[PDB]
Nucleic acid binder design. Structure first.
Ligand SMILES: [Mg+2]
Ligand SMILES: [Mg+2]
Ligand SMILES: [Mg+2]
Ligand SMILES: [Mg+2]
Lengths: 41, 49, 354, 111, 146, 95, 80, 52
RNA sequence: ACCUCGGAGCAGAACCCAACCUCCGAGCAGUACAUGCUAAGACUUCACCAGUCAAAGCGAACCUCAAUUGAUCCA
């Protein structure tokens, strides 16, 4: 039961994972956009 | 070792073999005070047994 | 303690007085060019070329070829330049060159490349592949006859053997069609030999075709002194060299000591040495064409070993030398259990007297 | 008094570990150096403390070769492009001449 | 006893004398090192381009320094069809001819080492594009160490 | 150490040695590297692996540990799934 | 002898032949070797496991060769 | 001025690693290789250990 | 007054080499987040401890710096 619960939790997180990949990446490029705006200032 | 004991006659194959028979044939030494729990049969010489 | 230099120093002829007034490398490309010529210079100190470069004898490798064709340089360059100004007077050529949309006819470029400068390049390729070291023991020739050879595959397909492309023995199983521009009354000899591929002798090669006394461009009426055996490189033995040699023959030559019998499927009889054969017949022909190719093992190769040659197919594999592993210490002071596993022989448990 | 402090560091034990003609196995460190005194040549790799080790197994040879730096090495290219014409730099390089072939083809079956 | 076939005498070690043998098996040594200097000499074959004031020239050359194949605007074969011998059209024509010549000779891989301005130059981009569509790969495969 | 005990008249074992070292029956002493669990944010990955290794000892250190341990720790032990059953013995060792 | 092995079905037998012709001798028999242990028991067990794996798969560098074959096609392109 | 921070994986594997970051910066989120799932996954910060 | 670490001279050219000898510094900072795993062969501050480089391989991609540091127990 413990092993199956751990594997199910890992599978759930990895299922949800690529959306957090892409939205963290767009957040990072938005940080780049804010940084280049601020150094344009 | 088992085949050697059988060929030299210290272990009788015509009767069931256990720890008393092996110890009486002096094929193994067992020290239960030194946490020995018996004899493990290992695979050396399986090709000629 | 000092020792004077054994020759001129490298940066010695540069005047160190007017070093602001001297001309300068402002270009990495200019420095790279000058450093490359200085690296190609001989030098009297120890050099990577001395320790790693290949050391040929200064024999000035003898030409065993045909004399070069003679051209008239003056009218040659006149025709060159007038073709050039005609093309430059073509207005659309300049427009295409400026718009970077021009092109070049590859087939015509190739064909008259073998017309003018293909022979010297072909000699350079075959020198790189090392036939003149192997086939001819150093002696060189410029192949002055374009020797087009192709293999009929399928019903509309054929395989050109150009100067070292890979041709599988499926494509090389039957006889290749050969052409080479020629005149009437001039005799020829065509030879196919496998250099790498001798299973027993490290020095000898195998004859595969010894067609002799060819009247001209027609190839099918000459004396077949040995039938065509398709190449047979063994499994895992690597990539082998097969060479077509074309010889200009002036007189007719008997080939009786070198006539392989009716179908000759013995490698001992098919043993061959281009050095010895051209040594025996040197005063008779002169090499004029050369085309070679590369081959690997195939199922057709398995077929020729089993059915034709009546052989159990040899199998070779490429094995690496055993690793170093220094002499084992009784106390491997700062090493791991991996050191003990390095010197272990068998991976299974052992029990000794028990 | 004696207001000078420090300077008590021991010697680094650097320098040549393998001279000319020494038989050297793969991965053996040839030289250890604080600056680029000897440069890597053929079959000699360089480690991030600028150490020199053998990439192949063989014989160590020290030669003297022309020096053409990488066009991204800015300070070296600056020295090159300020050098006078007709001059070339020379550096001492370390090579390993490999003694053994990579392997052999040998018969394993008679299929 | 069975009489052995006199053909079946095979040497227990094969001696392949092809200089391209271990190279095409990808077990031959590439000359590693020279990490401080330029260019890198860890290759088997190298494309080297020389753009002179009048001519564009290209070699395919072994590690030994032996020239395998060459192609130049110096040759009549190229001069008959270029408007000028120093254009990017010139370079593309040289690359197309050299690509078919390497196809022609059996050199399928080679290592091209341009300096940054050469690599950024349109002529060399057109050159490598012509080489790639001609059929040669400008990246050599890795050596099999084990 | 204690060469003759007060109760038995026997040599005693240094437990600090027992809790730090492992003696293979061939005669080798295995140990861990000092500070292999200290300041790993400072230590580089190659240095971390070097510290995670299990390393042997000198002849001098081995003789010293053999003197601090009694003969009970030098016996041959036939454990069930000992991961050092391979390393208890020497193979192909010439002098 | 692979061809006269009645305990193997016909199409999987042909699949075994065309898949492992590099282990078929000229007498038409399959050859399997094991040298992974110093016990002939384990070596024979490995050989039998190889036979079983071959039967079940029959029931069920490459880059270099591919690119050179593409170049051989591009040289092959010339018709009559 | 800097701080050592422990970052825990978002894959739920419990894997974690310590990095340094400036104290004045916000809460860190990185893409680091998780060896349990054999894949480069997100790690968010979860603790601050000591001051650097 | 100093006590630990590093660079230069003394110690000119493999290594090493002292003084309450002559000078200069260090007890970090910056980047990265595969700064992952594993593994031939070596170096070594004159011992040990500690320290250093690294082929190949798996998996990816297509670190600078000179010192910039602290063992065991225990928490
Ligand atoms: Mg000092
Ligand atoms: Mg000192
Ligand atoms: Mg030491
Ligand atoms: Mg590696």
């Amino acid at each position: 039961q413990k092993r199956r619960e751990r594997e199910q939790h890992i599978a759930e997180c990895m299922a949800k994972m690529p959306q957090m990949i892409v939205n963290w990446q767009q957040q990072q490029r938005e940080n780049w956009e804010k940084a280049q705006a601020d150094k344009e200032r | 070792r088992l085949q050697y004991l059988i060929d030299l006659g210290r272990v009788d194959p015509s009767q069931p073999i256990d720890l008393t028979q092996l110890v009486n044939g002096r094929g193994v030494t067992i020290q239960p005070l030194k946490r020995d729990y018996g004899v493990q049969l290992v695979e050396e010489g399986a090709d000629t047994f | 303690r000092r020792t004077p230099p054994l020759g001129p120093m490298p940066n010695s002829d540069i005047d160190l007085s007017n070093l602001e007034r001297l001309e300068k490398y402002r270009s990495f490309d200019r420095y790279r060019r000058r450093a490359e010529q200085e690296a190609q210079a001989p030098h009297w100190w120890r050099t990577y070329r001395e320790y790693f470069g290949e050391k040929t004898d200064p024999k000035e490798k003898i030409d065993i070829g045909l004399p070069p064709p003679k051209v008239s340089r003056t009218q040659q360059l006149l025709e060159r330049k007038q073709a050039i100004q005609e093309l430059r007077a073509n207005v659309e050529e300049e427009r295409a060159a400026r718009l970077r949309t021009a092109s070049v006819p590859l087939d015509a470029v190739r064909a008259e490349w073998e017309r003018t400068c293909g022979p010297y390049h072909k000699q350079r390729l075959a020198e790189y592949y090392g036939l003149y070291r192997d086939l001819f023991h150093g002696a060189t020739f410029v192949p002055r006859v374009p020797l087009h050879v192709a293999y009929a595959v399928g019903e509309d397909d054929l395989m050109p053997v150009y100067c070292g492309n890979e041709v599988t023995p499926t494509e090389a199983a039957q006889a290749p069609e050969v052409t080479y521009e020629a005149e009437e009354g001039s005799l020829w000899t065509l030879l196919l030999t496998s250099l790498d591929g001798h299973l027993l002798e490290p020095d000898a090669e195998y004859l595969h075709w010894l067609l002799t006394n060819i009247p001209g461009n027609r190839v099918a009426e000459g004396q077949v002194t040995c039938p065509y055996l398709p190449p047979f490189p063994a499994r895992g033995s690597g990539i082998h060299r097969l060479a077509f040699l074309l010889f200009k023959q002036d007189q007719p030559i008997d080939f009786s000591e070198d006539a392989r019998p009716s179908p000759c499927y013995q490698l001992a009889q098919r043993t061959f040495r281009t050095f010895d054969f051209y040594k025996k017949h040197q005063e008779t022909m002169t090499p004029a064409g050369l085309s070679f190719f590369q081959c690997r093992w195939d199922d057709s190769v398995t077929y020729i070993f089993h059915q034709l040659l009546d052989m159990r197919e040899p199998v070779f594999e490429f094995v690496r030398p055993p690793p170093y592993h220094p002499k084992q210490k009784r106390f491997p002071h700062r090493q791991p259990l991996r050191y003990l596993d390095r010197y272990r022989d068998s991976h299974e448990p052992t029990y000794g007297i028990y | 008094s004696s207001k000078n402090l420090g300077g008590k560091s021991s010697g680094r034990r650097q320098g040549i570990k393998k001279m000319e003609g020494h038989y050297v196995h793969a991965g053996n460190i040839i030289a250890t150096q604080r600056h680029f005194r000897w440069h890597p040549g053929a079959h000699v790799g360089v480690g991030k403390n600028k150490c020199l080790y053998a990439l192949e197994e063989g014989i160590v040879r020290y030669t003297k070769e022309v020096y053409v730096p990488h066009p991204r090495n800015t300070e070296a290219v600056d020295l090159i492009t300020r050098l006078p014409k007709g001059a070339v730099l020379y550096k001492t390089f370390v090579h390993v001449v490999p003694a053994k072939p990579e392997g052999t083809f040998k018969l394993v079956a008679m299929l | 006893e069975v009489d052995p076939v006199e053909n079946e005498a095979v040497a227990p070690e094969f001696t392949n004398r092809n200089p391209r043998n271990l190279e095409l098996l990808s077990v031959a040594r590439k000359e590693r090192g020279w990490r401080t200097v330029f260019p890198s000499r860890e290759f088997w074959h190298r494309l080297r381009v020389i753009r002179t004031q009048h001519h564009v020239e290209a070699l395919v050359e072994h590690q030994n320094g032996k020239v395998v194949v060459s192609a130049s605007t110096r040759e009549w074969a190229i001069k008959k069809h270029l408007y000028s011998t120093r254009n990017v059209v010139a370079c593309e024509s040289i690359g197309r001819v050299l690509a078919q010549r390497c196809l022609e000779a059996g050199i399928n891989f080679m290592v091209y080492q341009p300096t940054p301005w050469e690599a950024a130059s349109d002529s060399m981009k057109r050159l490598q594009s012509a080489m790639t569509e001609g059929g040669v790969v400008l990246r050599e495969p890795q050596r099999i160490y084990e | 150490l204690t060469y003759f005990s007060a109760r038995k008249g026997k040599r005693k074992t240094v437990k600090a040695v027992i809790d730090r070292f492992l003696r293979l029956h061939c005669g080798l002493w295995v140990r861990r590297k000092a500070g292999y669990k200290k300041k790993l944010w400072k230590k580089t990955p190659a240095r971390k692996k070097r510290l995670r290794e299990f390393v042997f000892c000198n002849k001098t250190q081995s003789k010293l540990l053999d003197k601090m341990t009694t003969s009970f720790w030098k016996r041959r032990n036939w454990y069930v799934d000992d991961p050092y059953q391979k390393y208890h013995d020497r193979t192909n060792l010439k002098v | 002898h692979l061809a006269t092995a009645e305990w193997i079905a016909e199409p999987v037998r042909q699949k075994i032949a065309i898949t492992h012709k590099n282990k078929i001798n000229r007498l038409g028999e399959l050859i399997l070797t094991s040298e992974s242990s110093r016990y002939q028991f384990r070596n024979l067990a490995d050989c039998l496991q190889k036979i079983r794996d071959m039967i079940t798969e029959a029931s069920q560098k490459l880059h270099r060769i591919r690119i050179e074959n593409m170049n051989r096609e591009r040289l092959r392109q010339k018709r009559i | 001025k800097n701080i050592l921070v422990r970052m825990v994986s978002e894959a739920g594997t419990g894997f974690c690693f310590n990095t340094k970051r400036n104290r004045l910066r916000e809460k860190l989120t990185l893409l680091h290789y998780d060896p349990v799932v054999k894949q480069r996954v997100l790690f968010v910060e979860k603790k601050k250990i000591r001051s650097l």
